[PDB]
Symmetry: none
Subunit: 87 residues, 23 copies
């Protein structure tokens, strides 16, 4: 949902390549995200990384469990931990 993903889009930041690697993105896909949205900035790169993960996983794969696991390996567990448990 939009509320379940807005904090991740807004507060992920410079570690988007690591998060993408933990989310199953190949190096070529990270290169495409880095290249296509260079003109729009880092916020666009993070948004498009999350969006392309959603498109790739559909509704069956875009689960909270897999996102939580990916963020835990990425060490960015603050995002989902705050968003879901605090709210």
């Amino acid at each position: 949902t939009d509320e379940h993903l807005n904090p991740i889009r807004e507060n992920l930041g410079r570690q988007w390549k690591n998060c993408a690697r933990k989310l199953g993105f190949t190096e070529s896909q990270i290169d495409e995200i880095d290249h296509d949205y260079e003109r729009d900035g880092l916020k666009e790169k993070v948004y498009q990384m999350l969006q392309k993960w959603l498109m790739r996983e559909g509704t069956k794969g875009a689960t909270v469990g897999k996102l939580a696991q990916a963020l835990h390996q990425c060490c960015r567990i603050d995002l989902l931990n705050h968003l879901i448990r605090a709210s």
Copy 2:
């Protein structure tokens, strides 16, 4: 049907060339879609790509299975996954 294809037409977007390649379009056909409907925009290009796939496949080939496979290879499984399973 119209309900089975409206979300794909409306939400496919910038990846229409990749989806067309996964749907069996030759490079010349993609060039024709890109050239003929440049004056109408990206929405028209996506609509005409889906429409020409339907004309090419008839009713025997325009099956949900082949569209699902093509979207899975295109990595745009969110479209059909949301449309069919969520609704």
Copy 3:
């Protein structure tokens, strides 16, 4: 018959030159259809293309098999595939 040809006349559209070429029309015949019925529109051009194919082939050549083959090469198999098999 009229029922076997009305959907093709009504839903063929902008690809009438390609369909005519796959139906055995020479370039001069396509020029004559394009020139004579410019004042009546695209619907008249498509109708006259089908009608002139019928006159040229008689009843021995105006078969479902040859029309199906011509539409398959034209990639407009949706027309006959829907009309004959769906109905």
Copy 4:
């Protein structure tokens, strides 16, 4: 009426294919409108799209409700929303 349709004819513009699709036009009919009135311009194409919708629907179908629904799906609700409610 003429006053209920003049703003739609004058201010619809480049989205006439989408509006026609939401109004029930088949792809062949859109091709005929695009082909026949290419020599007169976009204004003629929009005018003829609205006019052919009126002819197809008669007086029983050319209702404000169906036009409003079609414009809402087309996302061009500004036309009818301004014309009817503002005036």
Copy 5:
């Protein structure tokens, strides 16, 4: 009657070939109407198409029901729908 047919004669226009085809005219009859009254214009062609339909059908066939059906298939239902129901 004259009042039941004057609006159709006056407001039918460029779609007279399609209306004639839906009214049962063979292609040769449409050719004769197009050829004989080329010197008088489109209004004469439309008038003679309606008149020849009346002569062919007599009083037993020149019914409102068949004309309404033919106009509905021709998509020109505005003519009879306005004339009969509005007045």
Copy 6:
């Protein structure tokens, strides 16, 4: 008069359908003008549109005020504005 109408006939051009619609021509009348004088060109179509407006309005309706209003709605006010006020 001839001097009050020659610049309009000579310099109206491609917008003759819009001007005819603003002058009270029905769609069928525009179709007849477009069809009858296709063999003579656009200049003949414009001349016959103005001439048929004059015949329809007589001398009581063929006034400068109504022509000025029709040209203003058509956005072709340059014609009459230059002709009458400049000369």
Copy 7:
């Protein structure tokens, strides 16, 4: 109004994708705006984003409150805050 929207069109700039996302645009619509008006520049993209928001919302939705909320979430509150309160 034109005065209520000119400063937003002129001074929004590189954050148009974020503003569009906060205004309810789907990713496909942002792709269409980015693709269609690439030949005209960033100013055209911003203008068309605002214009398409106006068309989508009509007069009932194109309110100052919703635009203010969208700009506040986009963090571009300077636009409307200066325009409305300063003037």
Copy 8:
């Protein structure tokens, strides 16, 4: 005059949509200019934009003052500033 408008036609260029918006063109009119003269190029689009402004304004509105104001808001004041004051 021709000398007062030739430099504007020749040297306006890619900013023709902005200049048209500052000259009072609605979005639909800009769409018609962009669509009709796509086959002739940008020079034709600029020429037709200026020409349609002249037709719309007549001789009473096609004044140097309004053109100067429109160019000043468009930020293309070099055109008229050079043409009129330098020569």
Copy 9:
């Protein structure tokens, strides 16, 4: 002469509207050439533009000097420069 005009007819091309404007054609005359000979193509439009210039100017005006000046302003000086000086 035929030899003095064949290279201009054969090699003028897409810039025929600009050349016609530099040759003294009004916008209505260019509209008539564009409309009448749409069915024959661009070669016919260029041929008829040159031919109508010859008819308008007679033998007293159809001079090499005026054609050279018109081509120089049109920037198509290659035509006459090659034809006359090279041969």
Copy 10:
């Protein structure tokens, strides 16, 4: 004389209606020429237009000056300019 009128009869062509209008023919007279000699072709229509001008003007009105003026307004000055001055 026959030599002073043969080139005009032979080389006037498709602009005979415009030349007739510039020669003082009413619209009804042009209709009669167009209708009576439809079976003989365009050459007969042009010949009869010139002949009826001669009959109407007698020998006092069938002067070179008035024909030259009429051709100049018709823009077909090539005819008389070549015939009289070149020979």
Copy 11:
């Protein structure tokens, strides 16, 4: 002969005006062919162009050499090249 001219009549097509110009037809003669046989179509126009060339040239001028030269300048050398050399 009939065999030496049937392929040219059948396969010449839309370039009949250019071929007529290369065959020595004046513009008025092309206008007469275009006007007289508009009711019969393009095939009749091409047939009558060839026939009138034969009548004009007699048997002394209707030679293979001049027809070959005219087709070579017209760029339609496929007609005679195939007909004479292939057969």
Copy 12:
């Protein structure tokens, strides 16, 4: 032959201008192909480019060697290399 040219017509695509330039087409001829068949699309432009090359070269020039050389310079050697050598 048809089999020797169908793959080139079907799979040439966006590089048709370059292929035409390598095939000896002047810029005006490319402009005519681009302008005349804009209403039919890119497939028609490619088909007409090949067809006009065939007409220009006859049977003596439409050789495999010259087409192979032209495709080699155009860098589209895949077309003929696959068609002739693979089959």
Copy 13:
């Protein structure tokens, strides 16, 4: 104002991250400023930090008091203390 902010933009320097943190910027926003304007340098990063603070706060929040407090916590009170009190 420009004079109230130019010294801060020009003389803030290496402590821009600390100043941004004291101004309410999240870590992701600082990452975006650091990433987007790496190609332009430190001056651009400082300018964009101040500019984005202004956009975020509007005119109601971009007060001297809050900027003074933020600079005092950042320990860069020399900037505003010199600018406002000295001048």
Copy 14:
């Protein structure tokens, strides 16, 4: 003049954003220059910045004094100081 501006265009470089800010460009205008001409490089961005300054200022504002002041504030006084005083 071209000589008074070529050294500034050629030797301004990476400080074009600062120079544009000192020349009166708003942040949105700098964003448009940065976005539109990203595909052409830094030289194009600098050229278009100077060109748009010239268009905005006309001939009355594009003075040496204002450019010198803007370069002095930008600290790029070497450009104009060398160009004007050294030469």
Copy 15:
């Protein structure tokens, strides 16, 4: 084949310019690929680089040996080494 080239298209990425240089592309060709497909992204650029290599080399040059050599010099031997030997 498609299976022999899909991994290279999908996993080549940011080093496409180096791979193109090792594949024999001139700098202008790399510029054309970079410019034409900027609107579609890096994936399209890589796909079109491989496709244009295939067109340039035909079936005689598009060999596994030359691709392997080019990838070895490019240092991207993982692509072909994994694809061919692992599978």
Copy 16:
């Protein structure tokens, strides 16, 4: 000649705007080349820039000396230096 210009057309590339500026193209002409041939790519833009320079200069201006000077100022002297002196 074709051999004197083919290497320049093939190997000029991304610097076509700079070369056009050094060749005397106004900014509007560069805008027209960039806009008209966006659908065909960079190769078409370079080809049309050279072609329009040739048309503008005729045979008297399209000299090797002026092209060499323009390339020297553009810093692309490799093109002509290699082509003329090496061959």
Copy 17:
């Protein structure tokens, strides 16, 4: 919270590597913090060490107890002891 962590960020200082080791940072993570933020200084390194600890631990691990234990082992108990107990 911000108040519970500001004194630790501001007053930790040169012992940040020891504190990071007591907080569970691997040597590679300390190397990344030391390397990435060398350009910003020691304050940035300390801030990013605390921030990355917060991201790693989420809200479940970023407890006062674990921070107190880590500071006690680091021997920097003054920070938290003063902050929490004194205030």
Copy 18:
């Protein structure tokens, strides 16, 4: 594999230049890794060093033996020694 390389990517750290030198990277390649991924940090540099080693060596060279030898010379044998033998 991913499990055979994740500990090396995560725990290599500041000695990446030495490890790259022992892995066969030239000084220029180390410069490119250091320069390209300066904006992403040390983790990205280490990841890209390992990734580029994998691409360079393919599957035939990316063996455990060579990596073990390179780590032994680099003195970072803890990485592979722990990963492979401990697990």
Copy 19:
């Protein structure tokens, strides 16, 4: 002022930590000065200590009295005593 602070910057030396402590610097700030400017030397550390004192105190706190008191407690009264009283 610069003259009131140059002798202190130049002649303070090894006692900069003591002077900073007497000037109100916390231990963390002294650590940051010692760490950040280790690469530039002791002169840079002293300069940055004085500069950061100036930034912290603004113009209201950077008084001669407080500096004199701080130097007196630091026992470095020679600096200010010589500078102010001797000069």
Copy 20:
């Protein structure tokens, strides 16, 4: 030649700015190379620096002597010394 320049392109590295300065590049040209090819990396910057030197010098200036002198001043004499003398 390619063999005389490949080692310089491959092994020049981080000193490309110094080498460019010794090769006669102005600071603006180095800024353009640094800015345009930031998205492709250091290898692209070095390649484009060498390529632009070749374009600037042509074949008359791109001599081994000048490159050797430039590398000697740059202190990178290993490149050319190894390449030419060792091989």
Copy 21:
């Protein structure tokens, strides 16, 4: 000149911050030089410091006297003393 500044650029070294301070650089400008060119090294920082001094001072301020004074205060008088007086 280049010879008057090369020894200063090459032999200034670690004291570039002190020299910049004596040359009138503010602390923010030194921060920008230190930050922007950290990726290129100390040589680039020294070169850019001298270059920015030249740009700031123009030709009127970039005098030998002021540079000599700045170096004398910086205590680096060896540079200019050797360069100018020894040579």
Copy 22:
């Protein structure tokens, strides 16, 4: 393990060079440890000496026996003797 090495890291102290020599460190490695971590202190030097011993020895060499022998020769047997036997 961490518990088997924490007392050695915490209580080794000033004899770290002797312990490193007994642990197999070359003099250059001791110089690197002394130089790199001079800014962090003696604790960092001892920690990095132990850590680099662990990396060098892996898990096969980082045994208790070799550490005990090295400490016995170093005469610091109190560390391991207390840690292992006392606990």
Copy 23:
């Protein structure tokens, strides 16, 4: 060679400044090596000193004799004496 230089790189150590001075490095070059590679350590400084000596001397100067002389003056003759004579 690599074997002739690895022991010198690995075992030179803290005396790298003295060795660089004996190898002909100016003080500025030693400052650049000390400054650029401070983030990587002493091993990187020694490696880059040797590497830059190799680049400066090429293959003609990077002789064993000069390195032996430089090491003898540096008093580090153990390096080369052991490496060359012992092995």
